[PDB]
């Protein structure tokens, strides 16, 4: 099993949630959302990681994540690009994430992993699941043992992503927790709860979700997570995968 932000991530461990809005709106709104999500997960005993990307400038957005981390007292995650200053971001956030469109940029992935922080590596929509083993293997090649593989859908014809549930099983061969992006593999909102239930019933380590105060409304998050936690318990009771 893998350690991450003070809790354990794994197929046999309790499901965790990466959630937050897409982009940082206001310090006031970001702190309200982060606190609301923290309490909801606390009332459901779900380990929680806050996420939001940069609207406000890069430096100002970094401060809002600094204030969320310190005032709300939650771990924070954000994306990085090939031109992101890794040391400045790493001195603020707890989890780095590589976007799907960079998943084949091996050396950028290696630069990200070299920061010695947990990395959520998003599978590209142009990738077959078995190809993730090599992407993940290159990320771990210098000792970073905190890599995760994030499923976000695969291209299906034009302007359509399909969630191939086999990918959740195949990517267990990476030796990493598999995270399911429930709000991006739709990119049409009424399918988000259905697909999240499917992924959790198949068996995953964590959920990734965008929330709205292709997003799931904040006032509907607790009911959905309540149904997902019950589905997760059923998977673990009958699991023959561990």
Binding site for a copy of itself (CB under 8 A): 81-83, 101-102, 104-108, 110, 124-126, 128-129, 131, 138, 141-142, 154-160, 162-166, 168-169, 186, 190-191, 193-195, 197-203, 223, 226-227, 230-231, 233-235, 237-238, 240
Which tokens sit at 61? 């957005």
C-alpha to C-alpha distance for 97 and 60, rounded to whole angstroms: 19
C-beta of 117 vs 138, nearer to a copy of itself: 138
Identify which of 12, 8, 20 has the alpha carbon closest to the alpha carbon of residue 232.
12
C-beta of 28 vs 107, nearer to a copy of itself: 107
DSSP secondary structure code for residue 92 in this structure: T
C-beta of 70 vs 194, nearer to a copy of itself: 194
Q: How far is the CB of 220 from a copy of itself (least distance, A)?
A: 10
Q: How far is the CB of 141 from a copy of itself (least distance, A)?
A: 7
Q: How far is the CB of 6 from a copy of itself (least distance, A)?
A: 28
C-beta of 28 vs 237, nearer to a copy of itself: 237
Task: For the chain, list the strands marked E by DSSP.
Answer: 2-4, 7-9, 16-20, 48-51, 76-79, 95-98, 119-122, 147-151, 154-155, 161-162, 178-181, 206-212, 216-217
Q: How far is the CB of 49 from a copy of itself (least distance, A)?
A: 24
Q: How far is the CB of 110 from a copy of itself (least distance, A)?
A: 5
Dihedral, 116, 120, 125, 126 alpha carbons, nearest 10: 20
């Amino acid at each position: 099993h893998m350690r991450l932000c003070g809790f354990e991530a794994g197929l046999d461990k309790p499901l965790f949630l990466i959630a937050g809005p897409c982009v940082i709106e206001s310090e006031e709104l970001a702190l309200e959302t982060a606190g609301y999500l923290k309490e909801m997960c606390s009332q459901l005993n779900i380990p929680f990681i806050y996420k939001s990307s940069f609207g406000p400038g890069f430096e100002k957005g970094l401060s809002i994540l600094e204030k969320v981390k310190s005032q709300i007292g939650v771990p924070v995650l954000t994306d990085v690009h090939e031109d992101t200053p890794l040391f400045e971001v790493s001195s603020v956030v707890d989890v780095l994430q590589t976007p799907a469109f960079l998943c084949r940029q091996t050396n950028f992935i290696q630069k990200v992993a070299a920061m010695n922080k947990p990395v959520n590596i998003k599978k590209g929509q142009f990738l077959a699941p078995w190809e993730m083993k090599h992407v993940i293997a290159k990320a771990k090649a210098q000792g970073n043992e905190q890599i995760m593989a994030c499923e976000r859908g695969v291209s299906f014809g034009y302007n359509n992503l399909v969630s191939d549930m086999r990918s959740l099983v195949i990517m267990r061969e990476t030796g990493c927790p598999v995270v399911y992006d429930a709000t991006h593999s739709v990119q049409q909102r009424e399918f988000i709860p259905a697909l999240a239930r499917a992924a959790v019933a198949v068996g995953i380590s964590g959920l990734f979700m965008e929330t709205h105060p292709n997003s799931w409304p904040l006032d509907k998050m607790k009911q959905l997570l309540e149904s997902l936690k019950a589905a997760d318990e059923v998977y673990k009771k009958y699991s023959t995968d561990f």
